[PDB]
Symmetry: C2
Subunit: 158 residues, 2 copies
Amino acid sequence: MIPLLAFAAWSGTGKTTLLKKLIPALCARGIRPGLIKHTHHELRKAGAAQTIVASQQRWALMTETPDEEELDLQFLASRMDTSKLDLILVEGFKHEEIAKIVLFRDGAGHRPEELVIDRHVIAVASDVPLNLDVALLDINDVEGLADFVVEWMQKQNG
Amino acid sequence: MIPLLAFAAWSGTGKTTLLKKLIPALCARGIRPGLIKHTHHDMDVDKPGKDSYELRKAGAAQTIVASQQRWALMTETPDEEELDLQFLASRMDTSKLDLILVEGFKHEEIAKIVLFRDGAGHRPEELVIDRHVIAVASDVPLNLDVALLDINDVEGLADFVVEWMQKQN
């Protein structure tokens, strides 16, 4: 039920670095964030399809998917314990049919006209002015980005 | 919903080694097992803890890393350890499982098989067999209240688990 928000950028634009700065800023504001990331590349090998491993510091659930990739984002969010969370950030999926902020950096090897802005995009965080039908954000102002995220949250109540 | 079954033994008796061979044997009969385990190691070091380390270090309290062949959820518990067995089992996707095996916890209050190996230096008289025990798997004959299984007969053990499972449904 809690809000899901994707972040999208071309490689080399500095998305991971930005996320790493954005999370503590959200935390500082009382937000408890989750994150879902898509990547490429003995008793599990013995054949337990699902394994929980619990320690003092933390616990893990590991789910083997040998025949078909798990790509249903709403299903994955539902695995998290949302009683402990206010927001789930998302990155790296193809058919992201949720709200999305796009990152742009002018010297990062792409012209502004190459940007693809679909109907789910709510904002573009950029280091130069752009001609757009959505909110335009300063990508080098993380505090201000945290502001925009919180306000978007306080509007998603339902 | 689905049956939970613990395996219990003193350290060094042969619990993890036994489970290493039983799980394949169950899978061969078409049983799809889950596993819940306790560990004393630092989960940040492997695979897949390492994959989510930077994001959790920055403040992400729960992470999922999803790829072609598998996905992993991590839940940070910096205040108190998670030891609620029924909660843990409920976070599994039980629509795709038949049986959940449980191992390594100090307190495990469910159906249980207890293990004994003579050469481990303990006397059989020191075995604690409470009301939850359905069998003792042993390498020496014991005359017991509950079933007595050969700890070295893995297929026999897999048969006994199926038969117990039939009584649950």
